[PDB]
Structures are given as structure tokens and as C-alpha cells.
Scaffold this active site. Structure first.
Site, PDB file in Angstrom:
ATOM      1  N   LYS A 157       6.851   0.321   1.304  1.00 19.02           N
ATOM      2  CA  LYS A 157       6.655   1.363   0.300  1.00 19.02           C
ATOM      3  C   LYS A 157       7.534   2.577   0.560  1.00 19.02           C
ATOM      4  O   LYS A 157       7.917   3.277  -0.384  1.00 19.02           O
ATOM      5  CB  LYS A 157       5.186   1.792   0.252  1.00 19.02           C
ATOM      6  CG  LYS A 157       4.215   0.695  -0.130  1.00 19.02           C
ATOM      7  CD  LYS A 157       4.485   0.157  -1.522  1.00 19.02           C
ATOM      8  CE  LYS A 157       3.403  -0.833  -1.923  1.00 19.02           C
ATOM      9  NZ  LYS A 157       3.729  -1.599  -3.156  1.00 19.02           N
ATOM     10  N   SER A 195       5.876  -7.659   4.490  1.00 20.32           N
ATOM     11  CA  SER A 195       5.932  -6.384   3.782  1.00 20.32           C
ATOM     12  C   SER A 195       5.298  -5.247   4.572  1.00 20.32           C
ATOM     13  O   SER A 195       5.762  -4.106   4.478  1.00 20.32           O
ATOM     14  CB  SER A 195       5.271  -6.517   2.412  1.00 20.32           C
ATOM     15  OG  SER A 195       4.020  -7.174   2.511  1.00 20.32           O
ATOM     16  N   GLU A 239      -0.689   6.672  -7.359  1.00 19.90           N
ATOM     17  CA  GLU A 239      -1.794   5.755  -7.152  1.00 19.90           C
ATOM     18  C   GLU A 239      -1.595   5.020  -5.834  1.00 19.90           C
ATOM     19  O   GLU A 239      -0.493   4.986  -5.280  1.00 19.90           O
ATOM     20  CB  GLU A 239      -1.877   4.745  -8.292  1.00 19.90           C
ATOM     21  CG  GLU A 239      -0.909   3.572  -8.125  1.00 19.90           C
ATOM     22  CD  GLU A 239       0.554   3.995  -8.088  1.00 19.90           C
ATOM     23  OE1 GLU A 239       0.892   5.027  -8.706  1.00 19.90           O
ATOM     24  OE2 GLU A 239       1.364   3.294  -7.438  1.00 19.90           O
TER      25      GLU A 239
HETATM   26  C1  P1T Z   1      -0.773  -1.177  -3.494  1.00 24.36           C
HETATM   27  C2  P1T Z   1      -0.070  -0.894  -2.429  1.00 24.36           C
HETATM   28  N1  P1T Z   1       0.065  -1.942  -1.658  1.00 24.36           N
HETATM   29  C3  P1T Z   1       0.715  -3.124  -2.172  1.00 24.36           C
HETATM   30  C4  P1T Z   1       1.348  -3.939  -1.068  1.00 24.36           C
HETATM   31  C5  P1T Z   1       2.046  -5.207  -1.388  1.00 24.36           C
HETATM   32  C6  P1T Z   1       2.129  -5.701  -2.816  1.00 24.36           C
HETATM   33  O1  P1T Z   1       2.801  -4.750  -3.644  1.00 24.36           O
HETATM   34  P1  P1T Z   1       4.212  -5.132  -4.311  1.00 24.36           P
HETATM   35  O2  P1T Z   1       4.590  -3.886  -5.067  1.00 24.36           O
HETATM   36  O3  P1T Z   1       3.900  -6.350  -5.150  1.00 24.36           O
HETATM   37  O4  P1T Z   1       5.119  -5.422  -3.136  1.00 24.36           O
HETATM   38  C7  P1T Z   1       2.621  -5.947  -0.358  1.00 24.36           C
HETATM   39  N2  P1T Z   1       2.575  -5.567   0.928  1.00 24.36           N
HETATM   40  C8  P1T Z   1       1.969  -4.429   1.340  1.00 24.36           C
HETATM   41  C9  P1T Z   1       1.967  -4.076   2.804  1.00 24.36           C
HETATM   42  C10 P1T Z   1       1.309  -3.532   0.356  1.00 24.36           C
HETATM   43  O5  P1T Z   1       0.692  -2.383   0.749  1.00 24.36           O
HETATM   44  C11 P1T Z   1      -0.383   0.430  -1.951  1.00 24.36           C
HETATM   45  O6  P1T Z   1      -0.253   0.670  -0.731  1.00 24.36           O
HETATM   46  O7  P1T Z   1      -0.765   1.291  -2.771  1.00 24.36           O
END
Ligand code: P1T
Ligand code: P1T
Ligand code: PZJ
Ligand code: PZJ
Ligand code: K
Ligand code: K
Ligand code: K
Ligand code: K
Lengths: 249, 404, 404, 249
Positions: free
Chosen positions: B98, B387, B120
């Protein structure tokens, strides 16, 4: 040629007044009660009825309507109930438009929904989360089935976008929201003669009178929901007072 | 490298795939002024060398880029003797991908003269990233988070407050990610002239799907270089979990024009796709307009949003970004469901085999990588976007495995 | 390849003379396995294949090199000096501990040991040890004081998810020095098959030297990075000092730079005059403790005085022998930092730079702020940010009134 | 010249018996009571008393002795109380050596402590955490003040280290450690004639008799503390059985 709500606003300028545009959501507190309430609006002096399609994520709606539409969905309201409410309103003599978020229309089919709304006696569609930039299907369906298309303008609307939004509208333009509300109507009045409806959390006869001095229509929604929650007699009285306020200007 | 536009970009209106009309702007006119303002500012700064320098400097010295690519040889026996390569976004500052998107948007907010940033968050990783950048750049910050997510991701609520962000717990609807998005939207409508909306995934109205993807492209660009250097060739498959789609589109994008590279996104199937307690948007959803874009969503016969459910807060979302819907229609990417049980098994396996505690979100991608390895066979090279790290999930995982 | 042997002790492990600091104050029952570890380390420290294995894990698995970030927003709170953060908080598992663990776990593997034990205070060394043992297929048992299992509970659960047995130590002060005592007991009972993975630059020979050698990478990188970013050698390099592993790791590359000041900051708890502190150099005296001759907090009969600190990683009444040698030689200055000074620095780093530090590292940030005032405008001060504060979030939230 | 404990082992080997070596910590359950118990040891047939110095971090002590030393330290036991215990043991016609971790000796001063212990009638020092590699000071004080120096060997000791540790000892070599115990004693005998004491968790006459077959001394510590905790009469009874066990005829 001319809009479907044209005669309604013309009759209001002749009688030296603004139109009373009342909103109620279908299915609150249930489908029969809501239709009985919308009928009461016709008999109590509402010039135009906004039949609201309850939506699962109504980000534009305040807390009164959002909780009512949420209760309607817990009760099982379906989109077809809104078309049945439009028919009941047309049969009782009223003039009905539908206010809905766009995905229920997409799921129904844009052309098919316009067809069925017209057949029910509906006169137009208010599309709070549909801007003209995405309104290709709706402009075609609006023309084909002779329905008014009420888009929203905002105080923050750029001059370019306000002009394009007014140009795309038929029937009237919804001026959604201090001097900001008259300023917005004036910016619309400077580019077109289309009627302008103003929604401003109207609650009393006085507030309706104030807005009637510059707007072509006064839009009341949250207050009507609050009244109906107290009782159908309370809705009848409040609507009568609002019908008086729009005549003072 | 976001100054150069790709042939995968949408039109000026934000539409992918021409006549199919994925994306767009399904927003009220009340936001179009600021949405156009954000669009113009992004197009201006994305080709400004001062802006690119600021972003590169922060990615390197502050966020810790590049993230490494790690061949998890202890997983191979559990993946049909395929070779699993983990793109280690879990090592980024704040602990997930993120921060990539947040550093870009927070700098843009500063360029636009906005004084207040809202966001959000579901897992709390985007909330922590946003709070982090606002503390670094001295911006006021308000995070919207569903009440259920504040309870199961409590570690990140406390991190956000320590960083100086205000946290608003959202108790409406399903009290999860889609409801936090509704509330942040309402904030932006009321406060558009001074507030920047730092959206955390590759969805929403134009320009957010493209802009978020562009800030995440760095993942796949690094990974494509690293896999050629380490393995000697392009991968057989690149996989990632898919919530809104930001980390997946970030690692996919550099491989789009490599016709031999399979691309597989894995979405949360919760209790199972046949149970009605899942977030398998592509598996069980259908086209429609939702949260500013035309894409896929879980919706009923009238078009009402169906509430999602997943053990993973980050994937617990009934929608998906429009570029993914376009890539699915074109057949370039395949999207497959992964259940809670499958993800948690991969969670524990990654812990015991490689000593990496993953985010429960990323464990979905590891779970799918395991199944894809059995498909592709010995010697196949599979790159997996890891991720985030699972600090936020340690309580949930400990209860799952009976370690309390 | 291997760095020079200039500052190293003699074959018996003594710094500054054959009866100086360090040595081996252990029972004969352990001398066999200690000589075995010493011989194994002497063989592998000059093997390019061993250094290649370690380098490979540091790059692709742990994410080295860690960046050097100039914390510009701290400047005005440090006499307008320039503070550079060595970002060990971004290493895999969240601290510098992984550097030493990766070297020792590779060594334990080279020796054919099948069981690894370790002590832990903050839980970062325990997590790192559990991490490498999962990575390398070794059975792992961590010893942790009962008071520490309560205030660093996040790491207890991380260790258990990684498959390690965590044993809560209830004897003595129920903190770091007492976990070490129990790990010692385990080792003499299991010398045949068990490797003791010690977490700080203390203990009997060869552990002070081996741990420092595995942490040297911090200072080697920082010395290059600071010259590229500040254009010159720093005016000071500072770090927090518990047992001394992270401080010696960043200090060492600068020992022969006569113009680079070196300052270690130790934990003073409630205050050095209260008897609730861990200021080993400020209030301690030379003596034999935990296998080495160094400084410790001891009473008039030579009984160990129990330490206290809000920071579990610095709550230790002893210190490593090489630090004692460097202090006696006048090369490094050691100063106290109180609980309140550290927590002020903790919160300041949070809201100014968006980094949540370990409370241990907050002592070093606090000391650098004071040092920056003394050195003044323009001074270049490198600070070892030894870890991140995920483990301390609950403690910090309570301190700042963010949970009630 | 001979070691200060040479006579005792010579007198024991002539009587076809091992020496009974008894350990008690100073100050448990309090300073006067511990001196009473060490006196009873002399009265009950203990040839050599090991006066234990309580230490704050006794890593090599089992739970029984560790709990006792913790309690003694809570009661305020001092190193100087151990010197007083040696005086009382010498006065009762006993023979005392001190067993201590090394840091209390360093804080006291190695030469000072070896001087004051020799003055108090002490015959030697047992150093479980001091190996000959670090004992340069102690070797000097041991020769200066005519004190025996008892180092420990373990089953794991390398041939080179066992030989060096045995060479460095005076009085006896503490063979601490089920065939490991006699094999360790055999390795010591193969290089030296010095007496060998064996610690083995002895708690019965039978075990002491098994050890006296090959060892020159039987060392008992944990069992004595346990017996003392129950009561001084329980201590005398157990010591009597142990004194009977070390005798073969
Ligand atoms: C929604 C968020 N999390 C989604 C998230 C995701 C999925 O979100 P994507 O935008 O699909 O990559 C994958 N991996 C981690 C570590 C995440 O925190 C958030 O932190 O607000
Ligand atoms: C005692 C432990 N850690 C000490 C520690 C320290 C002090 O340890 P040194 O050995 O002085 O570097 C500094 N920073 C962090 C993040 C730490 O966790 C432990 O995790 O077992
Ligand atoms: O008009 S609505 O009720 C129906 C429409 O789906 C709602 N969405 C909510 C989300 N939102 C958004 C998402 C990401 C980034 C930026 C934004 Cl503005 C756009 C509009 C309001
Ligand atoms: O014999 S003791 O009671 C007195 C002695 O100081 C104690 N220490 C503490 C433990 N220790 C040690 C530390 C780090 C790595 C390896 C080891 Cl072996 C050496 C001995 C036991
Ligand atoms: K290549
Ligand atoms: K390779
Ligand atoms: K999804
Ligand atoms: K210390």
C-alpha cells in the site's frame, strides 16, 4: 418537442407559485403503506412525486432516507414495487418521476426500465449518480420513450459542466446542496429557462416559502419520511403546510 | 517510469476496452470538480521531474525499495516441485504494497495544495500507509474503517492513532471495507475543496484505477528484472491475490505483453463460493456499476450489492477494479477462488517452511500458487506477490491453529 | 571478502590484554561445545562459500541493504543537526537481530546440530531465531522472562506460529538476564545436539566476536551510504546499548575514523538515582557476569542488581565486553536515557517521520536529539534505528492515552 | 608439600572408606540456623564441609539448592557470613572448603578473599564457573595462602582439558555429572593420583556406597538441603546413613 413536466411548471408560474416536489421511498415502512402515503401526497397538494428506488449503498442520501430505504430493503422491497407505485400515483391523478441510483437500472436494462416506467405512467427519471458523461444509453432511452431526464448540478459544478448538465436535462434540473442555493439557480437561469428544483432539507412552511421566491420547484424528502414515520395523519398535515409555503412567493 | 503511458490505458473518460465500457466515472456531479482537479494534477505531475525525483527518493530511502525476490525452495515439494518466487512486498515500510500507491498520492495531495487527506481501510494496511505519509508530509489525516475491521485488525488501529491519524469506526452496512468506502465518499462530497481522497485500491472512478495501478507498476517492473536475473528467463506464471486489485495489477502490468507468461489472480472464497459467505467477485459476480466504476460485483437480481465475507479483511470486498474486468474479458488474466481454509493452510505452511508470516490476504496467493505448481509441474517458475506481512493477523491465525 | 582482525581479542577471547575484558567464565561442562563452536566459526568465517550463503540470504531473504533515511523533520528538535536513520527496522522480522541469527543458524547447520535454543527479551531475537529455524528445518526452543511474555506478547505469538516452543521463565527478575540463565541450563543438559543461538554481543568467547562480526554489515553499509548522501563522514554515530549487538555492529566500521564520534545510549528506567534502571556503564562496575568480564550492575558482595526499563530489549544489568574495552580506551562514550526521554522520542518519530520505532531504538533517537543540540547546526549524526515498534504498540498506546 | 586436604583422603583410604563431602548454603534458612546445620554435619561424620556462597544467578544449581540460596539472599546473607561459617566449622573440629561462583570473589578481591578464608581456617576453594584458563590470579593466591583449589571436570571434557584441569587442581578434582561417573573417574586416574570426589545427586546410603567403590570422596548437596528443610534431626539421620555408605570395611 416539449418536456413531460412542462405543463406542471407552466401551471405553477401561471398561479404565481412554485411546484411542490415530494419524495418518498418505495417500501417504507412497507410497500402498501408507502403507496398509501404517496397517494396521500397527491391528495394533500404535492405537484410532483419522486418515487425513490431503495438502494443498498445510498451514499448521497442523508440519515433519514438512508435508514428508511434500509428498512424497506429489510422488508423485501423490489424494483417492480416502484413501478407499481408509479402506476398507483398516475391512476390517482398525480404526476410521478422515479429517483434511483443507476445500478438497479443497469441490472433491469436501461431501455426496458424506461419502457416499463413509461407504461406505468412515469414521466421522468432523477439520476443522482449518473452524469451525462456516462448517460449514452439513458439519453437514447429518454428520447425513445418520451421521459424527462433530471440531472443534478452542485455548487461546485464548473461553468463548463453546469452548462453541459443543463443542456442534457429535460423537465427540470435538480440543484442539489447561506446564499449558495440562490447562486446555483442563478447560474442555471443564466444559461437556460428550464425549471430548477431546489432541495435543501426543507422542514417547514416558512423554508418552503423562502425557496419558492427564486426556485421553480421546492423538493422535500427527509421531512416527509420523518412525518410518515410519526403517522400518515402527520404526513398529510405537513404536506398541506408545504403546499401553502410554495404559494406565498 | 509513470511518465510514459502504455497501450493498456483507458480513454480520457476512464474507459477500458472501448465498447465494453469498463471503468468510467459513476459519481455524482458534486464530486466532478475535484475529480477533474485530481485528474489534471496527476497528468501534470506524472511527467514532472521534480515529482518523479521526490517519489524515487522516498521509495528508496524511506520505503525500502526495491523489495527482493526470494525463491522459496522449501515450498517446492508442496507445489508439484515447481519453483515459487516470493516478491517480498511484506518488507516494505509499514508492511505491505500500500505504501507504493500512498507515497505517490500523498505527494500529489501536497502538490495540489490540499490540507487534509482521507482514506478508507479494511485490513488497516492502507490506513497505516496513509497515516504514515501524512505524518511525514505534515497533513491532517482521517481514516474510515469498518467496525468489524477495527476489531479483527486492532493492531493497525493503534498504529494509525500513534501516527496522528483520526480513525472513524464505521458501523453501517456490513461494517467492513465497502462501508468504509461509502463513508469516505460522504466525507469527500462535503469537504472536496480542501480534502484529498487517498484511495487505496485499483477501483473507483477515473483517474483512481489507472493512477493507483501506475504507482503500483513498480512491483512488476522490479519483478520482471529480478526473475530474468535470478532464473534466467521470464516466469511461467505470475500470481497474486485480488481484493480491489491494486497489488495484482501492480505485479501483472509489466508482464501484460509477454504472451508466454500466465497471469492468475486469486480472490477470497470465504466459507466457499456455494455458501453465500464469500468475496469471489469474478467467480460469482456480474457486470454493473458500483463505487464509481463499471466492473464486476456481487449483486442480487435487482442490482443491490451483496455483502461479502472473508476471514481476510483486505479481500472482504464485493467489487473489483475495472482494469481487471477488462483483462478477464480479454482472456489475458484468469481469476480463481481460494477459501479461508486453503489460505490458512498456506499461511501455516509458509510460516513453517520459510519463516515468513504472511498477511492472510497474501496467503490466498500462496495457496493458489501451490495449486498452480501442481498444475505446471517440476521446474516451472511461478512468481507470487507477497503483498504484506501478517503482524496484523497474528491473533486471528493463533486462534485458527489453537496456539492460545 | 573477510574484514580485518585488527580489533579482535586473543584466542582466549580477551580484549585489551590477556586478563582483560571478555574471556570465558563458564563451567568446564560447556567447554567442549564452546570450543567446538569456536572452531566451527573460525573455519567458516574465512570460507567464501559460507559468506556467499550468508550474503544470499541477506540480499534476497532479509532484504539488505537497509536504506539510510535523512529525518529532516527531526532537525529542529536536535539543535538543527541532521539526523540519518539506519533503517534496520525494515529488515525481515523487524530488527537487526536477523543479521546475527542468519549467520549463527547457518553455522548451527554446518555443525550438524539439530536443535537450536535462544533467550529473548523483546522477542525480536526469539522471532528471528524461530524464523531461521523454520527456514532451515531446525527444532527451536526460546526462553523468555514471564514479565517479557506479557509486555511483548505479539512476539510470543509470532514465535509460536513459526513452530518454536516458547518457555516462560519465572525465576529472578523474570526478564532478559533470567531467560539467559535458563537457556544456559538447557545448553549444558543438551550440549550434544543443541546449538545455543545467543542474541547479543556478550557471553563467553566466541560470542562477543561472532555476533559483532555478523552485525558488522550495518556499519559497513552505513559508512558508504552516509558518504554518498552527506558527502562526508558523519560527526557522530549513535545507537542504543542493551547487550551491545546493534551498537557494535554499526560502530565497528567507524572505529578507525578518528573524527567520527561514537555514542551508545543505555536505558535509565525511572532514573539512575532511583535504583530502577539498566544503566550498566553509568551505575555499574567491572565484574564477571554471564560468561564474560565486563561491566554489570552489582551490589557490594557481587550479587547482580536486577535491572528495570520500559524497554524489554534494554532491560539488562550487563553489557558486552568489547563495549567495556571501547569505553576504557576512550573510543566510545556511553550515556543514560530515561523511560520518559525514550517515549518522547518514540512519539516524536511517529508524528514527524511516520516511523513507529522499537522502544529500544527510541532511546537512541532520544540521545541523538540531545547530541544534536550539543553538536549544533549542520552536524551529521547517523542513528541506528535497530527495529520497528509493532511489538510495543500496545505499550505506546497506553502511555499516550490512546486506549484509555 | 602436600595439599591441605591430603591428610583427610589419606586417613580415609587407610580406613577402606571414601570421604563424605557435604554441601550446605550459608544463610539457609537463616545465618544462625545454617551454622547449626553445618555444625551437625561435623558432629554426624562429614569429613569435609562445602560452605556454599549464595549467588544471585546460580545457573549450575538444581531447583533445591537454587530455592535455598534465593531464600538465604532474601534473609540478607553476606559473603562475610560464609567466612564466619568456616570459623565455626574449624572451631568444631571440622574441615571446611568454600564453594562459590567467581564474581563474589572478584568483588571481594581474589587475594583478600584467599587471605581471609585461610585466616578463618578454610582449606580450599571450589570454583564451578572458573576454569584454569581464567584462574591466573587464583593460582597465585592459592599458592600464597596455602589453599586447595578444586576445579570441575565433566563427562564431556576433552582429553587435553581434563589433563589440564587435573594438573591445575589441588586437594581433589570435582567429578560432576548411568556409567558416566566411573568412566570419568577412570580418565582422571589415568593421568594423576589426586583424590577424586563424585557428585551424582546422592540421596541414599546405597548410592553413596556405589560411589565409594571407585571414588575417593562422595559429594552430597541437594539431599542435605532437603533434609535440613524438613529439620535438623532429619539432617543428622541422613548424614549418618551417608557416613555408613562411604565405609566398605
Ligand atoms: C484493504 C486493504 N488491504 C487490502 C490488501 C490486499 C488486497 O488489496 P488489493 O488492492 O486487491 O491488492 C492484499 N494484501 C494486503 C497486505 C492488503 O492489506 C487495506 O489495508 O485497507
Ligand atoms: C533483547 C532483545 N532485543 C534487544 C534489542 C536491542 C538491544 O539489543 P543490543 O544487543 O544491545 O542491540 C535494540 N533494538 C531492538 C529492536 C531489540 O529487540 C531480544 O529481542 O531478545
Ligand atoms: O453516488 S454513490 O452513492 C454510488 C457510487 O457507487 C458511490 N460511490 C462510492 C465510491 N466513490 C469513490 C471510490 C473510490 C475513490 C473515489 C470515490 Cl469518489 C464513488 C461513488 C456514491
Ligand atoms: O555458570 S553460571 O551460573 C555463571 C556464568 O556467568 C552463567 N553464565 C551465563 C550463561 N552463559 C552464556 C551466555 C551467552 C552465550 C553462551 C553462554 Cl554459555 C555463560 C555462563 C552460568
Ligand atoms: K537474462
Ligand atoms: K538460483
Ligand atoms: K474481490
Ligand atoms: K544494559
Amino acid at each position: 418537442e416539449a418536456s413531460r413536466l412542462g405543463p406542471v411548471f407552466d401551471s405553477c408560474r401561471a398561479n404565481n407559485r412554485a411546484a411542490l416536489i415530494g419524495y418518498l421511498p418505495t417500501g417504507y415502512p412497507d410497500v402498501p403503506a408507502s403507496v398509501a402515503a404517496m397517494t396521500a401526497l397527491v391528495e394533500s397538494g404535492c405537484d410532483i412525486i419522486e418515487v425513490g428506488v431503495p438502494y443498498s449503498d445510498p451514499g448521497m442520501d442523508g440519515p433519514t432516507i438512508a435508514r428508511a430505504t434500509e428498512a424497506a430493503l429489510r422488508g423485501g422491497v423490489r424494483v417492480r414495487d416502484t413501478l407499481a407505485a408509479v402506476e398507483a400515483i398516475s391512476i390517482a391523478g398525480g404526476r410521478a418521476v422515479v429517483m434511483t441510483y443507476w445500478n438497479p437500472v443497469l441490472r433491469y436494462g436501461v431501455d426496458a426500465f424506461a419502457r416499463d416506467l413509461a407504461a406505468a405512467g412515469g414521466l421522468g427519471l432523477i439520476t443522482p449518480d449518473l452524469i451525462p458523461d456516462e448517460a449514452q444509453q439513458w439519453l437514447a432511452a429518454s428520447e425513445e420513450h418520451r421521459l424527462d431526464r433530471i440531472f443534478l448540478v452542485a455548487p461546485s459544478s464548473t461553468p463548463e459542466r453546469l452548462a453541459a448538465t443543463v443542456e442534457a436535462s429535460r423537465g427540470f434540473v435538480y440543484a442539489a446542496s447561506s446564499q449558495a442555493a440562490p447562486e446555483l439557480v442563478g447560474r442555471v437561469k443564466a444559461v437556460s429557462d428550464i425549471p430548477v428544483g431546489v432541495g435543501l432539507g426543507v422542514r417547514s412552511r416558512a423554508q418552503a416559502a423562502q425557496i419558492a421566491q427564486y426556485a421553480d420547484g421546492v423538493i422535500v424528502g427527509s421531512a416527509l419520511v420523518t412525518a410518515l414515520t410519526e403517522g400518515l395523519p402527520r404526513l398529510r398535515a405537513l404536506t398541506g403546510e408545504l403546499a401553502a409555503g410554495v404559494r406565498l412567493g | 517510469a509513470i511518465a510514459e503511458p502504455t497501450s493498456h490505458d483507458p480513454d480520457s473518460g476512464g474507459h477500458f476496452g472501448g465498447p465494453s465500457g469498463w471503468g468510467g466515472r459513476y459519481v455524482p456531479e458534486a464530486l466532478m470538480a475535484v475529480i477533474e482537479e485530481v485528474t489534471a494534477a496527476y497528468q501534470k505531475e506524472r511527467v514532472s521531474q521534480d515529482f518523479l525525483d521526490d517519489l524515487d527518493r522516498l521509495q528508496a530511502n524511506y520505503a525500502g525499495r526495491p523489495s527482493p525476490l526470494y525463491e522459496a525452495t522449501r515450498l517446492s515439494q508442496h507445489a508439484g516441485s515447481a519453483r515459487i518466487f516470493l516478491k517480498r512486498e511484506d518488507l516494505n515500510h509499514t508492511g505491505s504494497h500500500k505504501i507504493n500507491n500512498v507515497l505517490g498520492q500523498a505527494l500529489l495531495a501536497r502538490r495540489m495544495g490540499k490540507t487534509r487527506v482521507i482514506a478508507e481501510t479494511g485490513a488497516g494496511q492502507h490506513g497505516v500507509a496513509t497515516a504514515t505519509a501524512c505524518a511525514l508530509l505534515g497533513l491532517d489525516c482521517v481514516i474510515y474503517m469498518g467496525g468489524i475491521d477495527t476489531a479483527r485488525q486492532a493492531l493497525n488501529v493503534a498504529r494509525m492513532r500513534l501516527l496522528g491519524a483520526e480513525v472513524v469506526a464505521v458501523q453501517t452496512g456490513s461494517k467492513t471495507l465497502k462501508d468504509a468506502i461509502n463513508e469516505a465518499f460522504r466525507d469527500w462530497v462535503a469537504n472536496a475543496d480542501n480534502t484529498y481522497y487517498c484511495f487505496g485500491t485499483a477501483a473507483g472512478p477515473h483517474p483512481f484505477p489507472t493512477m493507483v495501478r501506475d504507482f503500483q507498476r513498480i512491483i512488476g517492473m522490479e519483478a520482471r528484472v529480478q526473475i530474468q536475473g535470478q532464473a534466467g528467463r521470464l516466469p511461467d506464471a505470475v500470481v497474486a491475490c485480488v481484493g480491489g486489485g491494486s497489488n495484482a495489477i501492480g505485479i501483472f502490468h509489466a508482464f501484460l505483453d509477454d504472451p508466454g507468461v500466465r497471469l492468475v489472480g486469486f480472490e477470497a472464497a470465504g466459507d466457499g463460493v456455494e455458501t453465500g459467505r464469500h468475496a469471489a467477485t469474478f467467480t460469482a459476480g456480474s457486470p454493473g456499476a458500483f463505487h464509481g466504476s463499471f466492473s464486476y460485483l456481487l449483486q442480487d437480481e435487482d442490482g443491490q450489492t451483496i455483502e461479502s465475507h472473508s476471514i481476510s479483511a483486505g479481500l472482504d470486498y464485493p467489487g473489483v477494479g475495472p482494469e481487471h474486468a477488462w483483462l478477464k474479458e480479454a482472456g489475458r488474466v484468469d481469476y480463481r477462488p481460494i477459501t479461508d481454509s486453503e489460505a490458512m493452510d498456506a499461511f501455516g505452511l509458509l510460516c513453517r517452511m520459510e519463516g515468513i508470516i504472511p498477511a492472510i490476504e497474501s496467503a490466498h496467493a500462496v495457496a493458489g500458487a501451490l495449486k498452480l505448481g501442481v498444475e505446471l509441474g517440476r521446474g516451472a517458475v511461478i512468481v507470487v506477490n507477497l503483498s504484506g506481512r501478517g503482524d496484523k493477523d497474528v491473533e486471528t491465525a493463533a486462534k485458527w491453529f489453537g496456539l492460545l
